[PDB]
Design a protein around this ligand. Sequence first.
Ligand SMILES: Nc1ncnc2c1ncn2[C@@H]1O[C@H](COP(=O)(O)OP(=O)(O)O)[C@@H](O)[C@H]1O
Ligand SMILES: [Mg+2]
Lengths: 233, 204
Amino acid sequence: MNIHEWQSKQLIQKYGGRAQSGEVAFSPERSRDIAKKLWNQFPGCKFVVKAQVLAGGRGKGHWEHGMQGGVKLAKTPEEVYEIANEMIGHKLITKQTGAKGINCNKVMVCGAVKILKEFYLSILLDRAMGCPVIIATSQGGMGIEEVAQKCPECLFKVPISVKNGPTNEQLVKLAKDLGLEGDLVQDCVDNVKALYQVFDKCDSTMVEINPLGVIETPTDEKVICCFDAKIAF
Amino acid sequence: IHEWQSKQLIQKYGGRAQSGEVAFSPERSRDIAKKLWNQFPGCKFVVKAQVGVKLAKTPEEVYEIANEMIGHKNCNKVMVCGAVKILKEFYLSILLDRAMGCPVIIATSQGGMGIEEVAQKCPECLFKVPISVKNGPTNEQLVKLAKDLGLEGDLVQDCVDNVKALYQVFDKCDSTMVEINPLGVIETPTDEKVICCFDAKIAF
Ligand SMILES: Nc1ncnc2c1ncn2[C@@H]1O[C@H](COP(=O)(O)OP(=O)(O)O)[C@@H](O)[C@H]1O
Ligand SMILES: [Mg+2]
């Protein structure tokens, strides 16, 4: 992750968005310290250890030395050490790789959150159109590439005005089209607005959020939260 | 011992405690809350003035509260804690009872209140448990104390674990009092129910 991209993820929170970025660790020891420090704030919480490799289906793939999964739930900081040790410096295999192997040199240590709904949402520069387009689906867990090829009308597509950007009516209906009601409608609007602010302020070619989730905070407020945000140029 | 050193000892010996993180300025208080939103977005915060306790919704509220604490009636640091869902507050201590000549465990379902006041007006609801310093506390004693506090399920064993860890701090530090007020039954962010020490006091 170069400075250009990392400075963009930061803008998500600046422009009103809500996102979990976790924290990067380049060693299993550091992975353990992260989880340990987090237990000082939310004792007894669980953790999610995510292998940081540029490849999809991490949660599906497997490791060369017996372990299963690129996204793993951990109960303690020691389990975080164990998992991270099997990831950092080893090859991960997914559909993207068949069996070529993809070497992992770092992990994300994330607090385990309660996820109520999962969505996919991206903002792309459509060259054939010469404008931005918001693409979203409520299948949530199935990933975009699968849904697009195998389901025609599952996707919500919204062309965006270059001068005006998205409109509240556009974003409100989209929030509604994703099954959101109550306060979560406006919360989603604010987050997508933030995502587009980033998309345009950074001359980005794609802003991908997978999952865009309805979560519960430790004190059980229901809020929109961006996971595993990705930006391209 | 100070509160931050006490909670450190409790975790070493197998206890669960919320330590928060210390800030010596309102600015640093805001940064702590900010970084915490990277792990549990949308969470709330508790701000405790240190040598009084307020709930904050944003890192900016955390700044405002810390600004009214640090440098005022004199407080010069704050602990910034993630706001945790709390189901029950208990009191628990381990005291060297001189009259009986042995350690004693004192516990109440009346967490948040001073033990002097609770015993004065509700002597009925204090659980005393003398400890044989040779064999220390037995797991049999601790299971009853847990049941007598209205605990069932995994919380009963979780309570034994934490109380055992507290006795170790008492025994190993040769302390005259280890006091947890409140000792809470909380819910983790994924709704697991566990025991947690929120405050600790160790006397010598
Ligand atoms: N911080 C977290 N807390 C709880 N569950 C999480 C967290 N991060 C991810 N998950 C869950 O684990 C899944 C991991 O999948 P994801 O990271 O989206 O990509 P992949 O499909 O490649 O595994 C998420 O879809 C979500 O259901
Ligand atoms: Mg909850």
